[PDB]
Design a protein around this motif. Structure first.
Motif, short mmCIF file in Angstrom:
data_model
loop_
_atom_site.label_atom_id
_atom_site.label_comp_id
_atom_site.label_asym_id
_atom_site.label_seq_id
_atom_site.Cartn_x
_atom_site.Cartn_y
_atom_site.Cartn_z
N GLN A 11 0.70 -1.27 -0.11
CA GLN A 11 -0.17 -0.11 -0.11
C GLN A 11 0.99 1.19 0.07
OE1 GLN A 11 -3.86 -0.41 0.22
NE2 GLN A 11 -2.70 -2.06 -0.72
N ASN A 12 0.22 2.37 -0.48
CA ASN A 12 1.06 3.69 -0.44
C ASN A 12 0.51 4.81 0.45
OD1 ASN A 12 3.09 4.32 -2.99
ND2 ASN A 12 1.92 2.47 -3.40
N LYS A 13 0.84 4.24 1.69
CA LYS A 13 0.34 5.26 3.02
C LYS A 13 1.31 6.26 2.99
CE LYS A 13 -3.28 3.93 4.05
NZ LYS A 13 -3.64 2.34 3.94
N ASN A 14 0.90 7.37 3.33
CA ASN A 14 2.15 8.36 3.53
C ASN A 14 3.10 8.23 4.46
OD1 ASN A 14 2.62 11.43 2.70
ND2 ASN A 14 2.47 11.52 5.35
N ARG A 15 2.69 8.32 5.85
CA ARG A 15 3.70 7.91 7.16
C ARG A 15 3.27 7.00 7.98
NH1 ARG A 15 5.57 11.14 12.02
NH2 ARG A 15 7.95 11.44 11.66
N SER B 57 4.54 6.03 11.78
CA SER B 57 5.30 6.08 12.83
C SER B 57 5.11 5.31 14.07
CB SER B 57 5.31 7.86 13.17
OG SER B 57 5.23 8.37 11.95
N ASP C 255 -0.61 5.49 11.37
CA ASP C 255 -0.83 5.44 9.94
C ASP C 255 -1.75 6.52 9.21
OD1 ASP C 255 0.76 3.07 10.43
OD2 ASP C 255 -0.44 2.01 8.93
N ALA C 256 -1.89 7.76 10.23
CA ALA C 256 -2.85 8.64 10.16
C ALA C 256 -4.17 8.30 10.89
CB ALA C 256 -3.26 9.20 8.76
N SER D 1 3.79 -1.48 5.58
CA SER D 1 3.54 -0.93 4.41
C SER D 1 2.15 -1.93 3.53
CB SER D 1 4.54 -0.86 3.49
OG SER D 1 5.34 -2.38 3.39
#
Ligand SMILES: Nc1ncnc2c1ncn2[C@@H]1O[C@H](CSCC[C@H](N)C(=O)O)[C@@H](O)[C@H]1O
Ligand SMILES: [Zn+2]
Ligand SMILES: [Zn+2]
Ligand SMILES: [Zn+2]
Ligand SMILES: [Zn+2]
Ligand SMILES: [Zn+2]
Length: 1169
Positions: A337-341, A343, A363-364, A436
């Motif tokens: 997957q193309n997640k942003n951030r 942490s 992941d937001a 990811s």
């Protein structure tokens, strides 16, 4: 040599011609008769062809336009005197146009009327010449009338049910017979079926036609009946009691699943008739003049031949596909997957490959250990993947990681599309994966059973519905896809060290891999070439030196065209043209060792076992006959030794020197599983026996059980022998069975009622029935068991609207309501093998779905009866279920070795092969129980034996007989009675040779006097069969005209009351020469199935006694079911035969009961943290 007019043979058998005074021919209707068409009476009549042979009017001659004429004396229509006094003698009247039955007198002679081109004639008495012909037609009509009325009363009746009806039907006084027989039916099969067909054709519907009744279908096959023709003779003319929950399940399945090769033969007369235009099917045709939507064929054009084949296909399992390999792990690649951030949150909970376990991550969205996520497969047919986050860590080599414990979608289980689309199941699949690959956070609710789950039965599901659901995924059960087992989740708790890392799947898969590796435990001694060991473990079993051990039969070996046939005497003999493996080798462990390799260290990758061989009596030079009397438990010590692989071991058994035992052998053998004993040693080289060397020496309360559809109590008996159950309540609608249950269970409360009645009363608040029997209430029933008949829902073809309604209110639904209401700890549903395959496996799937909805642990499996100490091949579908808080029982391992073709226990549902926990594939510790073991001790009786109480006249001869007779001083032999077969059948049995494999094809073609005074004449062969040829003597082998290409069956080629049944060579080519019919049981063999009503030409396999000229007795059938001789049966002989046949064999029920005892012990002695 036949007549050109009528089909009768000019020479033989018993032809007849006409006799006239003589007088006038038709048109002289003037004497007394003259006074739309005119009508008169006709007595002393006779029908004949143009050549003057006395012909029957019911074989289709008139309709083939062969002119049949007749004679006799005509009378005024108002005359009732049959006496000729009286009348005007007529001749050559006709030819006959119509003929019909004007009704029956009292009684019950059928009154037939003729019709010429001139007048109509109501018949009276036949001429003495025509009397026998008219008597047969009289017999045809009455028998056909009984059959039709019989088939209307029950649509499930079998072939043997039909015969019994015919045999118990008192023939009218008009016929000078005092009884009908099976031969009476086969004699007139063609006419009877035609009447049966014409019953339906008159009354069109959507329901199954009356001729597709099982007994009729067998009759049409046994006798060579031609279907689809003519219908002229007329002259015009159990509902389930349910709980809301159970009802809702089957009602919703209906609503959400209601709507929807072979072709017409095209040769039968039904197919050759034009579309009528008066039925709803034709009225709905575009071609004058309906919509054309139904697209249904003309109501007067449904091919009966096509109907038969569709009925045959419906009884077939389509199919048992070879492979069908094993169910793959639910596997492939996933979408990154193309997640942003991504942490981490907080900091490392634990530090260890320098893996740094974290607790939360962003992941937001936020994720903790225990949360559930979705993962996208790159997709084949694959849906969204759902898993529980069991751990979160950052590897210093891999990226940011989480461990995913996979959920299984309900539709991917055996439940299929019957499953709640939002229900998930826990699964033994887990995986390390990168963060990811996480698509989203997901809410999965654990729907645990409420703490008073046992009392929520019958409740309105709207009351428990609260609150606000179902909107998301939920789960309640763990699922095993190999065994189709739904079980409660493991309550396994993690250590404080494991808390943020623990995965139940990893733990279970770890324990699994450890047990499957054969591992040396304790060392004992160190020698130069090898290292000795004291113990070793394999499959969770601890093997120590001196233990008994099971080995495959190939582990070690021991030190050890007739003359020609008279084909005139035996004209049907030309039609006569894997075994059970050996039981386990048993050895005592002398040494456990591993060879040292080149470096001097022990090689524990291969573990060896030096074993002392044990001889079964069969392994002795005495061979097989030594097992006849010997205990099935007995061995002989040997000083012979062998070295085997530890891998080869099949389990641990107890082999004890009998004298050292602290108790009786009987008590010892009955004490537990895998217990063997020996008293003597055996020397192979001397072929003799001697005392063994001295280095060969060394609580729970029963479950209150309710048995629904109890019968005589075969299932309850087995459970009682297991010591797990007390059947305090039984429901049995059929009185003789219920009565028999009472006799064997004095402390039980048996309700002779329909099961739907009782539950309705209990759900109404009542405490007793009208008879005043105390009804069982919530809490009373701890175990519910039952074997409901499948007659309502037993087709393999998929459900339709009509057929589902019958299942919607079936006894399965009724039985499930008992389970839902009472909520027992354990639940067993016994049925036929094909219960698992009925309705494209929807009956099973809906049953499992219903149990899962109720919150039950559940599974299914197929068991072969013969593998549990019984001389019989029958499989049963068994559905097990356990309440939450209980352990779901396993299926019992086969105790007895048995033929592998009778041990196909696997199940295919939606192209998914399912298998039970059973590991013994047709292998086992004990030898096969034979017919000899079953009944070789019973005294000789005759055909029609009726003496209820006799003496054994001898002692038991086999282990099996010793166990079933019991330990009574001078026991009474009960119900060693058998059916009084007819004179013809009795003569047939007497001429079946004793050699194993003998059946009807061994029958001699001879004239014999039957016990009814009649003569059975030889079978006459009339046609040449090019598919079988002529005999070596040059004799014909055909028996009808239908043996040549494209020819119709010829009447007057029919023969009856013959030793060799005419119908068997008639239809033999189409049915494997009817191999087995009139076949004797083999002493080394077994019963082909559960015998309920033994008929030689029936559907229940070979039923003749191995030596005696009779059909098997009730006691012998009870012996085949493993019933104790002291077990009481009730009613007439047929009532007793059906009781025994319907029963679950106690040895099988006991084996199942023992697996339940283990769960009871586990719950009582094992607690979890
Ligand atoms: N509606 C109904 N209510 C109660 N019993 C029924 C019933 N319909 C059929 N039965 C009974 O259920 C029995 C099934 S065969 C009985 C099982 C066997 N005796 C055993 O040992 O397990 C039949 O004897 C039949 O009489
Ligand atoms: Zn003729
Ligand atoms: Zn047809
Ligand atoms: Zn029509
Ligand atoms: Zn895991
Ligand atoms: Zn024929």
């Amino acid at each position: 040599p036949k007549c050109i007019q009528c089909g009768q043979y000019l020479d033989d058998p018993d032809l007849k011609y006409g006799q006239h005074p003589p007088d006038a021919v038709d048109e002289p209707q003037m004497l007394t008769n003259e006074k739309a068409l005119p009508q008169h009476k006709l007595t002393c009549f006779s029908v004949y062809c143009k050549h003057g042979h006395l012909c029957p009017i019911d074989t289709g001659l008139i309709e083939k336009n062969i002119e049949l004429f007749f004679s006799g004396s005509a009378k005024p229509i108002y005359d009732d005197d049959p006496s000729l006094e009286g009348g005007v003698n007529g001749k050559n009247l006709g030819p006959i146009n119509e003929w019909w039955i004007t009704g029956f007198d009292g009684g019950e002679k059928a009154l037939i009327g003729f019709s010429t081109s001139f007048a109509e004639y109501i018949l009276m008495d036949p001429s003495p010449e025509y009397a026998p012909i008219f008597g047969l037609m009289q017999e045809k009509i009455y028998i056909s009338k009984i059959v039709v009325e019989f088939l209307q009363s029950n649509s499930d009746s079998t072939y043997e049910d039909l015969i019994n009806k015919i045999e118990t039907t008192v023939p009218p006084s008009g016929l000078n017979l005092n009884r009908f027989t099976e031969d009476s039916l086969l004699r007139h099969a063609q006419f009877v079926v035609e009447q049966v067909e014409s019953y339906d054709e008159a009354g069109d519907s959507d329901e199954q036609p009356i001729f597709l009744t099982p007994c009729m279908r067998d009759l049409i096959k046994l006798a060579g009946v031609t279907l689809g023709q003519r219908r002229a003779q007329a002259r015009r003319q159990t509902k389930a009691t349910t709980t809301k929950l159970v009802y809702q399940i089957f009602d919703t399945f209906f609503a959400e699943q209601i709507e929807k090769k072979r072709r017409r033969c095209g040769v039968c007369e039904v197919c050759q008739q034009p579309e009528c235009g008066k039925c709803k099917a034709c009225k709905d045709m575009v071609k004058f003049g309906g919509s054309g939507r139904s697209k249904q064929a003309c109501q007067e054009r449904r091919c009966p031949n096509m109907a038969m084949k569709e009925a045959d296909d419906d009884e077939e399992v389509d199919d048992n596909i070879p492979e069908m390999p094993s169910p793959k792990k639910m596997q492939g690649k996933k979408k990154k997957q193309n997640k942003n951030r991504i942490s981490w949150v907080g900091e490392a909970v634990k530090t260890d490959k320098k893996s740094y376990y974290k607790k939360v991550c962003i992941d937001a969205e936020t994720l903790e250990v225990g949360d559930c996520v979705s993962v996208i497969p790159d997709d084949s047919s694959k849906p969204l993947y759902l898993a529980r986050v069991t751990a979160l860590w950052e590897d210093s080599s891999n990226g940011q990681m989480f461990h995913a414990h996979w959920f299984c979608a309900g539709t991917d289980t055996v439940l299929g599309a019957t499953s709640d689309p939002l229900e998930l199941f826990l699964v033994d699949e887990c995986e390390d994966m990168q963060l990811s690959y996480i698509h989203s956070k997901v809410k999965v609710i654990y729907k645990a059973p409420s703490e008073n789950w046992a009392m929520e039965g019958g409740m309105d599901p709207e009351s428990l519905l609260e609150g606000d659901d179902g909107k998301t995924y939920f789960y309640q059960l763990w699922y095993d896809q190999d065994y189709a087992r739904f079980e409660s989740p493991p309550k396994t708790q993690p250590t404080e060290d494991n808390k943020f890392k623990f995965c139940v799947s990893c733990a279970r898969l770890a324990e699994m891999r450890q047990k499957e590796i054969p591992r040396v435990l304790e060392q004992l001694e160190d020698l130069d070439s090898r290292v000795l060991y004291y113990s070793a473990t394999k499959n969770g079993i601890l093997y120590r030196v001196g233990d008994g051990v099971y080995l495959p039969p190939e582990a070690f070996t021991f030190n050890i065209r007739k003359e020609p046939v008279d084909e005139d005497l035996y004209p049907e003999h030309y039609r006569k043209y894997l075994d059970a493996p050996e039981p386990y080798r048993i050895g005592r462990i002398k040494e456990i060792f591993c060879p040292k390799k080149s470096n001097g260290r022990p090689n524990e990758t291969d573990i060896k076992i030096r074993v002392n061989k044990f001889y079964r009596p069969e392994n002795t030079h005495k061979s097989t006959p030594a097992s006849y009397h010997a205990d099935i438990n007995l061995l002989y010590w040997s000083d012979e030794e062998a070295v085997v692989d530890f891998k080869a071991v099949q389990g641990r058994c107890t082999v004890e020197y009998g004298e050292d035992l602290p108790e009786c052998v009987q008590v010892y053998s009955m004490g537990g599983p895998n217990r063997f004993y020996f008293l003597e040693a055996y020397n192979a080289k001397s072929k003799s026996f001697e005392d063994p060397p001295n280095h060969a020496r060394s609580k729970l309360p029963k479950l209150r059980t309710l048995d629904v559809f109890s019968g005589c109590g075969g299932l309850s008996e087995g459970f009682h022998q297991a010591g797990i159950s007390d059947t305090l309540w039984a429901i049995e609608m059929w009185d003789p069975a219920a009565q028999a249950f009472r006799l064997n269970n004095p402390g039980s409360t048996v309700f002779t009622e329909d099961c739907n009645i009782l539950l309705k009363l209990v759900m109404a608040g009542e405490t007793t029935n009208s008879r005043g029997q105390r009804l069982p209430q919530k809490g009373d029933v701890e175990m519910l068991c039952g074997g409901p008949p499948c007659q309502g829902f037993s087709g393999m073809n998929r459900f339709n609207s009509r057929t589902y309604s019958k299942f919607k209110n079936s006894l399965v639904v009724s039985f499930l309501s008992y389970c839902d209401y009472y909520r027992p700890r354990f639940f067993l549903l016994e049925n036929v093998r094909n219960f698992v395959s009925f309705k494209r496996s929807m009956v099973l799937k809906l049953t499992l779905r219903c149990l899962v909805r109720m919150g039950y642990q559940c599974t299914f499996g197929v068991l072969q009866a013969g593998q549990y100490g019984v001389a019989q091949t029958r499989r049963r579908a068994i559905i097990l279920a356990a309440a939450p808080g209980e352990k779901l029982p396993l299926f019992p391992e086969p105790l007895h070795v048995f033929a592998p073709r009778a041990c196909q226990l696997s199940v295919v549902v939606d192209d998914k092969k399912f298998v039970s926990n059973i590991t013994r594939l047709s292998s086992g510790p004990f030898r096969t129980i034979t017919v000899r073991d079953t009944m070789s001790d019973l005294p000789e009786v005759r055909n029609g034996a009726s003496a209820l109480e006799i003496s054994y006249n001898g002692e038991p001869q086999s282990w099996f007989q010793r166990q079933l007779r019991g330990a009574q001083y001078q026991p009474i032999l009960r119900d060693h009675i058998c059916k009084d077969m007819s004179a013809l059948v009795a003569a047939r049995m007497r001429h079946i040779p004793l050699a194993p494999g003998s059946d009807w094809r061994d029958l001699p073609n001879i004239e014999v006097r039957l016990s009814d005074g009649t003569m059975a004449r030889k079978l006459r062969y009339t046609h040449h069969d090019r598919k079988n040829g002529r005999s070596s003597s040059g004799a014909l082998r055909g028996v009808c005209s239908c043996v040549e290409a494209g020819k119709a069956c010829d009447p007057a080629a029919r023969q009856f009351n013959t030793l060799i049944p005419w119908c068997l060579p008639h239809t033999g080519n189409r049915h494997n020469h009817w191999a087995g019919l009139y076949g004797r049981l083999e002493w080394d063999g077994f019963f082909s199935t559960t015998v309920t009503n033994p008929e030689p030409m029936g559907k229940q396999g070979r039923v003749l006694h191995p030596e005696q000229h009779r059909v098997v007795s009730v006691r012998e059938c009870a012996r085949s079911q493993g019933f104790p001789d002291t077990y009481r049966l009730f009613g007439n002989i047929l009532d007793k035969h059906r009781q025994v046949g319907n029963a679950v064999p106690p040895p099988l029920a006991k084996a199942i009961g023992l697996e339940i005892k283990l769960c009871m012990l586990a719950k009582a002695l094992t607690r979890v943290w």
